[PDB]
Amino acid sequence: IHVGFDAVTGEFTGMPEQWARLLQTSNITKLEQKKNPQAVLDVLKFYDSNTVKQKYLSFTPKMTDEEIMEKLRTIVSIGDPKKKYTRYEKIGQGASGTVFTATDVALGQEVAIRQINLQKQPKKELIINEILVMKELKNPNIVNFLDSYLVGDELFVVMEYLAGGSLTDVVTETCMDEAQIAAVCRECLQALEFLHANQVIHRDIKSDNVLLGMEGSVKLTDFGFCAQITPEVGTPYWMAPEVVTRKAYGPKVDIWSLGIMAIEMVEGEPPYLNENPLRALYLIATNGTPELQNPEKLSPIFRDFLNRCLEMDVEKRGSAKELLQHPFLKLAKPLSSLTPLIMAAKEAMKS
Amino acid sequence: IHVGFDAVTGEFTGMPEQWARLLQTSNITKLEQKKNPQAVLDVLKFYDSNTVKQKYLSFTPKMTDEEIMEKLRTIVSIGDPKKKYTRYEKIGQGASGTVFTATDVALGQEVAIRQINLQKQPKKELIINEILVMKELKNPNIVNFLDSYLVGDELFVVMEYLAGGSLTDVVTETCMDEAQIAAVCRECLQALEFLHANQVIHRDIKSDNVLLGMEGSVKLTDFGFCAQITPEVGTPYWMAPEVVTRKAYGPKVDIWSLGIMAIEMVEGEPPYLNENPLRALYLIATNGTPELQNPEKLSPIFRDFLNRCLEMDVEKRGSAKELLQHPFLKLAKPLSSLTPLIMAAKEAMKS
């Protein structure tokens, strides 16, 4: 319902008590409110309603046990997941199932295992169709579906994984040069080109969801339900302005998030770290890019790259297929150059 | 290859060294040998070759995981067998899988669970077809298929069971009257009529494979692969003469075995208990019926029943559909009359 704004007093008129509550807790000043009331009102609407939600790739080119067994025909192997994999470690649990990392005993290569109870979720058909899609959606810069197993009522879905940890672990414990950063950016853009070409928007490009191999190979995770194989309230620093303004959005939100990720790689921490989430959302909507700590060090060509990623105008902002041609990615080192940083990160992590 | 017999010396000529070995260990006398050499030679052939074997009901009106999942479509439930059943007790294990008894937590009724590894058996198709058949083969005097569950590579098959133990436990610890014996015989004949009507020969009718309910209900087990839910070299006391003479045989072998079972019920132990297995087989082939310990006590009409069951001539011997009309079964008590004997048996068993 319509709400107003009395410009000299700086008070919104007729807004819900939820939005008024949030506004009091927001640390947005009455200067910042009268500067742009519409931006404030948009980010109140967003935070009041962003329960995060789930994502399922229903892009496939009440349920009974025969229907389930029929849908599972093409995707279930006969095998014991407690015998095919060792070094199980539980990496998380929630309504969405339980997640483990483990290693294949025959190949010696690491995997992630999501364990879904098919009786306790009503959206059974969505989960299975998600798996059917993911079996056919194959690319080297995403974690791919490997295998699945039925264990009574539990379905085990096995995804690729990598031993070298997350890009956050590298970025927090080491300093990357621009030739390393361009190599990461190239592999993430190769992933985004493929996902966008299959009507997938990732929505959550950040260093936490970028996985590194010990040889320096790079994969994205958290693009689907099955690919959520990461431990994950807080501040949504990776989000683009059209998202937090509650406006319509499309695949170039992932290009913004990649830009913020490139900032995080050169600054070692994400933006808005100690900020109130509501004020961080306000700043994203009004200012766009956060402000750099030491911007004078960065090459012209990296700054051009960041500008094409973090342009607030969606039409001006690069697409994945375009930014793959951007001259910054010419500077990229071999991916093996990440190896010493991955090892440095691991030896710092311990814990 | 042909072997002979020199009638005055009492020596077989030209027989294999296996059969000669067995003959030395057989405790069959040279009198008994020259009395009927052919019977001896038949039972040597039988014992040398009876590795028991398995039985599969392939009466349905190299394998890949999609083929397996397709065959399992109609028979696998989605559920956890380690959650649907409690009071698991392991009752046996062999090449054929592992067997448990357990009770359904919701119904409060006892069940048997066979647990089959589908990777470690090559005859996968036979096992699944056995289950598909058994799902449609339903009768109250056999243990029926209830449910099945897939647990990785292990298939769990759930069969009915009964709390009152085996007829052997009743027959060894109590004395049955003829009206109790006729009630058991009636229910076993009801089972054999149905099995014979579906081209099934049981082959192993004995008190060990007769299951009792606490209310006195009666079911057969060990007619198929899935129905082998009983702990089970030794002497084959239940076998008919045409079987042990290695001759062709048909469903009236079950009627012989039922006759021997009726003897076991009134005598409290099976025949040939302390006998050499080779001599027991010789006696079955030549004498037919074993000799009763106290035959003067038994009614005329029970003796007529036993005669129709234990006639050595297959043509004279009763069929199930015929013996169901035999006047002995008119004497049958209500099945509840078994209840005190079942409880007496259990309270003796303890252990």
From Swiss-Prot, chains A, B:
<feature type="modified residue" description="Phosphotyrosine">
    <location>
        <position position="56"/>
    </location>
</feature>
<feature type="region of interest" description="Autoregulatory region">
    <location>
        <begin position="1"/>
        <end position="54"/>
    </location>
</feature>
<feature type="modified residue" description="Phosphothreonine">
    <location>
        <position position="60"/>
    </location>
</feature>
<feature type="active site" description="Proton acceptor">
    <location>
        <position position="203"/>
    </location>
</feature>
<protein>
    <recommendedName>
        <fullName>PAK-2p34</fullName>
    </recommendedName>
</protein>
<feature type="modified residue" description="Phosphoserine">
    <location>
        <position position="58"/>
    </location>
</feature>
<feature type="binding site">
    <location>
        <begin position="91"/>
        <end position="99"/>
    </location>
    <ligand>
        <name>ATP</name>
    </ligand>
</feature>
<feature type="binding site">
    <location>
        <position position="114"/>
    </location>
    <ligand>
        <name>ATP</name>
    </ligand>
</feature>
<feature type="domain" description="Protein kinase">
    <location>
        <begin position="85"/>
        <end position="328"/>
    </location>
</feature>
<feature type="modified residue" description="N6-acetyllysine">
    <location>
        <position position="45"/>
    </location>
</feature>
<feature type="modified residue" description="Phosphothreonine">
    <location>
        <position position="51"/>
    </location>
</feature>
<feature type="region of interest" description="GTPase-binding">
    <location>
        <begin position="1"/>
        <end position="29"/>
    </location>
</feature>
<feature type="short sequence motif" description="Nuclear localization signal">
    <location>
        <begin position="81"/>
        <end position="87"/>
    </location>
</feature>
